[PDB]
């Protein structure tokens, strides 16, 4: 069921975007792209590294959500890309930023796909 | 290219109501906090409102609380200022613009539209 | 409400010249100030971000510097293409401007 993942992950992906937008100001744009969102089925392999890598610096019990979710559309073990996160503070802020916008928007390319 | 196009504007008297809309392009339009901006006759520039990526979120500057609406439809790509009891110091070119997070600089402006308020 | 205080409406300079235009914030804004420069008939167009970053595609003689309340944004060499209204912004806080100070060409 892509269409069930899709609809349990839309709501966690909606709030990390919108809180990060109320909480956090003057965040430039990295203007990269992170995510991948197809390969066509929905590219958990490309996707999960990422949110891996800033479980860290975020809300580790959504991300642990999304994580779950995203691996059951994972149709093999296929590899996973080791993430650089940066260290500067900005940096850092516009790639969690750049993440959460891009899983955005690929949710809903992929639900105007569905429909 | 990123794309924002205003309108609506338009001559009314003081307590009139008008609608602004601002329709992007070249974007993933719920990826992004939208505002407004307006400026007055003598050039001074004053943000108006704020609205975060699916609108749970909105800010709104004093002057016009309680008088205007910000509110988006990401599904039509467009953002509206609905302006209620109008006075004439909000005669201004308002502008629809793009930022990251709700409380940033805007790096994306349209080319606005003028809102007159004139008994 | 933070206020940002552009004390010069206007500015004579000369091409070729060094600009500096000030602006001061009533609180600790940190380096969360922007700076806009604007033609008549024009959006404002977004110059320099967390008070001294160039935004893309900026010449290089535009710049800003300074970081706690008191910010300089300036011009190494007028050009005539430079000849405008500049405007600070910051955004420690909900937006506000400073009033604008217009360049024009002394004769």
């Known amino acids: 069921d892509v269409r069930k993942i899709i609809l349990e992950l839309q709501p966690l992906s909606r709030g990390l975007l919108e809180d990060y937008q109320k909480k956090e100001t003057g965040v430039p744009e990295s203007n990269r792209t992170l995510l991948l969102c197809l390969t066509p089925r929905l590219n958990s392999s490309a996707i999960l590294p990422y949110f891996r890598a800033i479980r860290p610096l975020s809300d580790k019990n959504i991300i642990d959500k999304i994580i779950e979710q995203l691996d059951k559309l994972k149709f093999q073990h296929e590899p996973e890309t080791e993430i650089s996160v940066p260290a500067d503070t900005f940096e850092c802020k516009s790639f969690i930023l750049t993440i959460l916008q891009q899983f955005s928007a690929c949710l809903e390319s992929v639900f105007k796909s569905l429909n | 290219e990123v794309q924002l196009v205003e309108s609506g504007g338009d001559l009314v008297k003081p307590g009139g109501s008008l609608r602004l809309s601002c329709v992007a392009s070249?974007?993933?339009?719920?990826?992004?906090?939208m505002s407004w901006v307006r400026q007055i006759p003598e050039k001074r520039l004053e943000w108006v409102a704020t609205?975060?990526?699916?609108?749970?979120?909105?800010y709104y500057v004093d002057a016009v609380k309680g008088r205007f609406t910000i509110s988006r439809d990401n599904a039509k790509n467009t953002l509206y200022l609905q302006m209620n009891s109008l006075r004439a110091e909000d005669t201004a070119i308002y502008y629809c613009t793009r930022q990251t997070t709700m409380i940033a600089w805007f790096a994306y402006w349209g080319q606005g539209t003028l809102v007159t308020v004139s008994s | 409400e933070i206020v940002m205080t552009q004390t010069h409406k206007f500015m004579s300079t000369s091409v070729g010249d060094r600009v500096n235009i000030t602006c001061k914030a009533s609180q600790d804004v940190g380096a969360a100030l922007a700076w806009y420069q604007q033609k008549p008939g024009q959006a404002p167009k977004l110059l320099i971000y967390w008070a001294s970053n160039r935004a893309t595609g900026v010449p290089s003689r535009f710049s800003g510097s300074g970081s706690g309340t008191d910010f300089t944004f300036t011009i190494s060499s007028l050009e005539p293409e430079d000849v405008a209204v500049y405007y600070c912004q910051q955004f420690s806080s909900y937006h506000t401007f400073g009033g604008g100070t217009k360049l024009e060409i002394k004769r």
């Open positions: 609205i975060s990526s699916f609108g749970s979120y909105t």
């Open positions: 070249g974007f993933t339009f719920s990826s992004y906090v």
